[PDB]
Symmetry: D2
Subunit: 391 residues, 4 copies
Amino acid sequence: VKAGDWLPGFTPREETVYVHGGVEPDPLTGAILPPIYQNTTFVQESVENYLSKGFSYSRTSNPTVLSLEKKIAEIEGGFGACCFATGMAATVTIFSAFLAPGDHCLVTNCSYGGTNRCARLHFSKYNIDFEFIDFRDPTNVEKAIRPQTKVVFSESPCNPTLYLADIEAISQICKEKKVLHVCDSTFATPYMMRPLDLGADIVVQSTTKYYDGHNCTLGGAVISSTKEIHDKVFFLRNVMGNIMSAQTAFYTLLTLKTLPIRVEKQSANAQKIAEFLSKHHKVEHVIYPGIPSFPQKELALKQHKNVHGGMLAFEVKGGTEAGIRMMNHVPRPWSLCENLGACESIITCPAVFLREDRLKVGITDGFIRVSVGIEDVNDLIDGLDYALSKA
Amino acid sequence: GVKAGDWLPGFTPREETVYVHGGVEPDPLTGAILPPIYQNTTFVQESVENYLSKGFSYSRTSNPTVLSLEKKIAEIEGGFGACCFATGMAATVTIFSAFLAPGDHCLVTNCSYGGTNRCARLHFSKYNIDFEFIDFRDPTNVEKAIRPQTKVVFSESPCNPTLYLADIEAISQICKEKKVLHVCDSTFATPYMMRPLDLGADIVVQSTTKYYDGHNCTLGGAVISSTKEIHDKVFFLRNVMGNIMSAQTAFYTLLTLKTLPIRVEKQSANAQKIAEFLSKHHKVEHVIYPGIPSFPQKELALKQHKNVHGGMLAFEVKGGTEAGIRMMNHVPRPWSLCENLGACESIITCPAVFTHANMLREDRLKVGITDGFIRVSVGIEDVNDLIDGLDYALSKA
Amino acid sequence: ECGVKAGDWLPGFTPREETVYVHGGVEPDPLTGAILPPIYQNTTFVQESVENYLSKGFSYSRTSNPTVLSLEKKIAEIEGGFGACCFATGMAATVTIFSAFLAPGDHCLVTNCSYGGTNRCARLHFSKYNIDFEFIDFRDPTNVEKAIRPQTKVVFSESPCNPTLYLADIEAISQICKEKKVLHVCDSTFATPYMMRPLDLGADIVVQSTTKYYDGHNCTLGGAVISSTKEIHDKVFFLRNVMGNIMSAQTAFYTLLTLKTLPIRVEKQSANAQKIAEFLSKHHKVEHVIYPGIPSFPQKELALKQHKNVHGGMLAFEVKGGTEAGIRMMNHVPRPWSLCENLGACESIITCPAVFTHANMLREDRLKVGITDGFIRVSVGIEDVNDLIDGLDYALSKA
Amino acid sequence: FECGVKAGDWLPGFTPREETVYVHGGVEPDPLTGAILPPIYQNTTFVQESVENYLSKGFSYSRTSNPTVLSLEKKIAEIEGGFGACCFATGMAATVTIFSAFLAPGDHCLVTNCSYGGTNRCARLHFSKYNIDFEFIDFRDPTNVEKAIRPQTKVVFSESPCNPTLYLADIEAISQICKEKKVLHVCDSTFATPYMMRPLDLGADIVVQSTTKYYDGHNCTLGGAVISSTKEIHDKVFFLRNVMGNIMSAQTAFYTLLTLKTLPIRVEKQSANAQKIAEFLSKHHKVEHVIYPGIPSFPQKELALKQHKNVHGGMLAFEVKGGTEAGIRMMNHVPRPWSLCENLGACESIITCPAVFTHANMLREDRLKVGITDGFIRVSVGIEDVNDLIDGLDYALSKA
Ligand SMILES: *Cc1c(COP(=O)(O)O)cnc(C)c1O
Ligand SMILES: *Cc1c(COP(=O)(O)O)cnc(C)c1O
Ligand SMILES: *Cc1c(COP(=O)(O)O)cnc(C)c1O
Ligand SMILES: *Cc1c(COP(=O)(O)O)cnc(C)c1O
């Protein structure tokens, strides 16, 4: 083999896949990065050679988006991947493809609020029955499955309570029951957990959070384990017109190269911050998979690779008013906003951004979600200490 | 005392002024004449109490650049509001997802855009929604087919690719009398030639990919709503389905929309000349263009078309499918053999051999797509080069 | 006849003007068929071997880039030159000209009412290199003939001039410089190739600020040097690599998009400008109007000989009442007008050089370069001309 | 620590630590919208509200200044520890602006003889035509710089580490010498990055950066930066950048603002991988010499540990046994994940041989005078798994 070739029998290791996976220099010019195909249509050789070069119209497929999809499928370990404008678009495409009137769908009751509301308020009007259950015990999944059940939709770790779901056990249950297991691994990243290695049928990802990790783009990704699922997803994406654009795909191809080192820094910072918070006299409870008080420490040790993530949560003593004061006084470098998984550490209120339906979802009084970034951990802890001084 | 930066109080801007400036003012912070690109996911909040005080939180729900474009588009189309989407298909599917439910009936023109038709029949009907495809050239047919289950009447004019016209005013009168939502896709028309919201339509769907862009650069869609209620439901469902337009695409479209009037004027003058040339060419059987006397709906065209008759035309070659294939395989530069329309670059397509090549012949003659039908999207090149290329190609058929 | 197929031009085809603006120097992407050139937003290019170094034509984006190269071939075709080199700004292009073709002890003739950037560039920077710049009247070519020295290497003309709209006979000056064997460089930013191509008229080098009409949307900055011979082009290319002022791929993509509508943009701008100049010429508050399309124009013979299709989107006038009247007018110019510094855009722009850009310079020099006290520069856009005239009328009512 | 600041403010008197500055320096949420990232002002001109309020909002024309570029410039000035900074289309543009602003006919300028080939070519092929004398000397000894200073000397242009021999220059001693002799000190710290060495901290007057390499670190954009220690130097550079029309674009500034946030962790990973790779290469039968500041064989190890912070860098060099032919064989058989190209400092590992690619048309004596031997290989270590990089290098050396 010569320059530009991978060694025969090569299995690139993880970080190599994040830097190089599924992307090669441009054949025409040798450009080390994939050029941006900011372009609607593609000229055909003739009528008989329609699609001979692989492209026709950017709503159906785009070369930059295709390069990103190949990289994403390689990173998550699936057959194929389809990229979308947003993570909600990926979720909605899954629900549109695999649910018909009369079908049943099991969802984790602490899913992302957008997923829950899109199921509850929109798709329910098509006479699809969504049942929200506790995924912490896989036996609940096994006993709630009906003959009409098509999709089991898990999420691990959960937004924002950080509950874990045993992806391997749930997937075994679903294979025995012949139902599609879809897993939302946005909080974990493939660097900490790949549900496809654990038997899941589909992975859904909001690339907005960690794939980007720069507060730059929006994006979604559906990673399919087989060709049939992938082809159904691709067809429906073309039908619904929610494909990701070439510029976003270029941004994400760039940002994905640093996901491992970013997540390593974020999870080290998060470990230190969780320990600090767990020894703080104004903090009632701290949720982080890496500290011994984590209720699902056994599952986290079984399921998490490399790290325990940049996401944590905590409750301030005194409830809603103390939490609101603290968040109103959290100083820079923190940012009080709605995203997560970025270089910029973010602090959020889930509720104030009915308590009867929220206390059942785990978001109790004074629940604070923390997305740790890559700043100096001491500056972050200084800001947190000052903010807690106002609680 | 009107000063620099203000509009004169009682002076409504005219059309081209609206296309250049509509709904976009210089950046308050810096004075930037173009609004900056908010290539940015999230927006910092001043406090928990002052949530959304500056109007933004998350770009999937709303983005400042996208919002500027939406204000310009709503101004140009003459509606209350607008929501911009990643594609035109996204906008159409958002309409269908918002206003249809199992058991409802929806009327669509049988010569709709292929994507609209395929989206209805292969996806939404699995939700037990009945889509009936009737001929919209006679509004009394729409008046007949409306039932108590009917919720949406989906018209298109001019139609892709047959350029059939629908009388938006008469159809809107019908739907208003019958209390049913009239949605019109005027992508082929552009707001410069026809504004369905002026003609009584309740919703307009646009694929900004075509003429709003006009440069083969971006994908995009738009839903322009006549009332606050329709706009609010479209906005909510767009946030739910995550198919909003990107900020970079919105910037591109804000740039290209400024030249839509002159672009469409050049394209339509070129198209008139090309249609006349084709109509007096011996290897051409039929020519379809609203601006030549042989157009079957000349009365409606003169009634509801403004300024121009469009850059789209169509024609049939003598000898049918094989002759059309030969000709299209021999259409030289400056022409492009591809799938888009409405761009500065002139484009030749065969919907029977490219878009509906997998479709059977028996049902493609019902869409009016004869085999040998050729869709022409005229660009802004010198019309003599375009005619020379067409003549060379026709010599091969 | 022939047997060319789709994607081919007819044999020996010479595209007409507008066709060159839409398609010139750009073919679909050979790899994918993409109708537009993809953006090569990347720094370095991988080589397949030591032997095949540069075999695919690219190594490093500072030296050259595929998107920039597409734009450069298009611009060379549009201006009718051998080659083109694209730069980050128009001033970058001009500075590269001056850096390449002047040395200590050399003489260079510049039009006295040149653009302020070129004048400042020569007087405040390059003069330090013992290059002697002389600023003369270019409205009479015999002035150019009489000012040429044995040490002269460059004659830098500009037509129409920024902002006086003075013209220069590019053909006669080109004849003079050919006779005495000195390089003729011409800045035709204000004209655009759609109105005047100096290389057609015997110029050796054309300099363009693509920021203005090439862009025409107030979006990007950019410059271009178009060379009539391979030797000049190679010198410019080498120095552009040395100085690191190449245009970026994103800017090149923007300009490739915007250039496609320059003909229709300029047609609309010039029709609007003709109507606006005719309106202002009759105006109570207006002292003079300067536009090549009205009989008032002093150099109308040269304009009719030298201008193709249009007389441009630029005009200028003088408000009666001096600097205070100018200031009142500017302070009350309403939308759709904009009070700013660019020109050639779809958005109509208006400004007064004496109180904004040239406020620091002494009145004697302003009058020396023809910029009177009430001088107003007007870049006409593509808005409805009636709204523009209404705005001008109100602003003048406050004068 | 008893104050009353709230969300959006820094703590009073706060000086953030290094990584915090890389993420947040020079940048705050957008006042209009709260946008956490600076919007891209893809925009030429800026409307003025009045004749009297001209420039009251800070901007007029993007060739002179642009808000995105200014945000990046503030971040860079904070990161390098300087008064001000101006950003340019390329690094060569930054260097060219320095040479244009501070040199006149008859002036003398000392340049490190192993400077980046572009700077050397810039000096000899273009600026020397203005009767500016450029003398190229060995900067590894500050006494050489002091003895080589002439009455007409105005600029001393150091580089450390130098492209590509990785020679070091004692920035602090050279700065002391220049400050005594009242001469400008410009330092090209492109290879080092501010994360490893900040020459303004060590007394330099001007820092020149190619943001193309490590600031970007993604093979994405070109750019340059001039960081000035005083307002006077900064104003001179600003004025001349407006004259030269070589300012950075807003889009490039946005890209670089994005990528600068990960420079610390990127450089940490790159330098750890580079330490391992240099050891593995110090260790090979086909390798004659390895040059990396982090291994004991480095000739300037003492200066390296005095001057370098946190890391020893992602750049290394070595020389294969067997000269140009073995070097060519290895280069022709360097497999993925390596790339054979001309940039450096990126996430993608890059390898090249200057004597056969960029300096191939250069005389051999001229190359050996700069220390570019026949088997000389320049290695830019990325952030891939170091074992894959080592396997690729081992396969390539097997075919040498
Ligand atoms: C944010 C999020 C989503 C939605 O992705 P978007 O890009 O915002 O549409 C889905 N799932 C999870 C777990 C998320 O955190
Ligand atoms: C092309 C087209 C569409 C689809 O719009 P996209 O932007 O391609 O998704 C819808 N309607 C009509 C009339 C069209 O021509
Ligand atoms: C504006 C202008 C220039 C300078 O070009 P920039 O892109 O602004 O640097 C040069 N010449 C003329 C005639 C101009 O109008
Ligand atoms: C690459 C480089 C430069 C030139 O910077 P560009 O961005 O390529 O113009 C200058 N100095 C050093 C040390 C370099 O490595």
